């Protein structure tokens, strides 16, 4: 991003940490739910409790 400092427009790179930070443009809402059904399949929880 481009934060605004004391009359400057200094750029600010910053780590994304979790996979959820990716914009809902690049990791849509249904995508994460489909991915979570993958993980509950991997744990043998396909019908969840």
């Amino acid at each position: 991003t481009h934060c605004q400092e004391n009359s400057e427009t200094v750029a600010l790179c910053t780590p994304r940490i979790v996979i959820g930070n990716l914009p809902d443009g690049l990791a849509p809402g249904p995508f994460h739910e489909l991915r979570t059904w993958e993980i509950m399949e991997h744990m043998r929880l396909r019908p969840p409790p």
Partner: protein
């Protein structure tokens, strides 16, 4: 599944015949008498016999032309085997020690702390690290890798021959000798893209300074230590400093395409390497002229692949979908023809 997707690019080298045609008296060749210089190793005297030739051309247009006639066989493996970046960038290591020990053991690459002058040289430069493997039953092998958005459209982007970069960069469209306007069309995301008019089909490669640009633009790659022996199929798309400099009036372009557009690739070793420049046959690469790449047959699942192998002659070209899974039909029927025709 982690959040991102991959869009591997992979060049494949075909042995082939050409047929040339040339007009009568198409170029005169002035020659002078051969002259014989002499040398002596005192065990034996070599003599050398030079001759001079100059070829004035005698045609205003092109008096000659060429066509690729016959593909005999494929040199390249056409396997997948994605390229090991741990050997392309040997110097880089994680700051923490234990984490890099663990990562090397997980990815399968490790270095032994012998400080062999070969290891010192390799980490310093070149050294052709790979040393080919036990029994090569297919041939030369490589693939490349572009971290990408899963939302990427394919029906508009992967079914047809197109640019892996995510933003079309055919300098043939751009006004000749126009660097201020050639740098927008390949880089700027406010100005609307070529083939598809969406700004950028993949942001993480099409931006200037994106991860894939800084990863494969050799101008960026040099600032980091990297092995130059290894040939990277993707770099021709991302060497933007050169392709910006390539846009020139049509005929300078098609003269450039005959002279530099070639990309030497070492032919005896297992993996592709940059040949000793121009010692061998230079390999022509038509995809370099258009800066595009051809889709090959791909399926998400085996079920869609079985239907292809079970299907008719035209089966490989048709693309299909199934709620999530897809098949990207090939543009060129080489999997039908070079293989089955034999």
């Amino acid at each position: 599944h982690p959040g991102f997707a991959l869009t591997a690019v992979r060049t494949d080298t075909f042995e082939v015949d050409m047929l040339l045609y040339s007009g009568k008296s198409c170029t005169s060749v002035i020659i002078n008498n051969p002259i014989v210089t002499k040398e002596e190793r005192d065990i034996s005297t070599t003599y050398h016999v030079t001759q001079n030739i100059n070829t004035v051309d005698m045609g205003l247009g092109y008096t000659s032309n060429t066509c690729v006639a016959y593909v005999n066989r494929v040199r390249t493996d056409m396997g997948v085997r994605v390229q090991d970046l741990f050997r392309v960038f040997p110097m880089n290591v994680y700051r923490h020690d234990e984490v890099d020990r663990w990562i090397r053991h997980a990815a399968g690459v490790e270095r032994p702390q012998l400080l062999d002058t070969e290891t010192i040289s390799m980490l310093t430069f070149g050294s052709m690290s790979e040393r080919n493997a036990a029994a090569t039953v297919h041939g030369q092998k490589a693939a490349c890798e572009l971290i990408l958005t899963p939302v990427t459209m394919d029906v508009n982007y992967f079914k047809i021959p197109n640019n892996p970069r995510g933003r079309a960069s055919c300098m043939l469209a751009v006004d000749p000798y126009d660097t201020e306007a050639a740098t927008k069309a390949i880089y700027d995301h406010r100005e609307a893209d070529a083939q598809t008019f969406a700004a950028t089909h993949n942001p993480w490669a099409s931006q200037a300074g994106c991860l894939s640009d800084v990863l494969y633009n050799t101008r960026h790659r040099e600032r980091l230590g990297y092995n130059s022996k290894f040939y990277s199929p993707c770099a021709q798309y991302f060497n933007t400093e050169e392709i910006i400099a390539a846009n020139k009036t049509l005929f300078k372009t098609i003269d450039e395409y005959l002279l530099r557009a070639k990309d030497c690739i070492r032919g005896d070793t297992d993996t592709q390497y940059v040949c000793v420049e121009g010692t061998e046959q230079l390999i022509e690469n038509p995809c370099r002229l258009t800066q595009e790449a051809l889709p090959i047959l791909s399926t998400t699942t085996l079920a869609l692949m079985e239907t292809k192998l079970k299907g008719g002659a035209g089966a490989f070209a048709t693309s299909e979908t199934h709620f999530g899974n897809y098949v990207v039909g090939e543009i060129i029927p080489l999997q039908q023809s070079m293989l089955f025709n034999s």
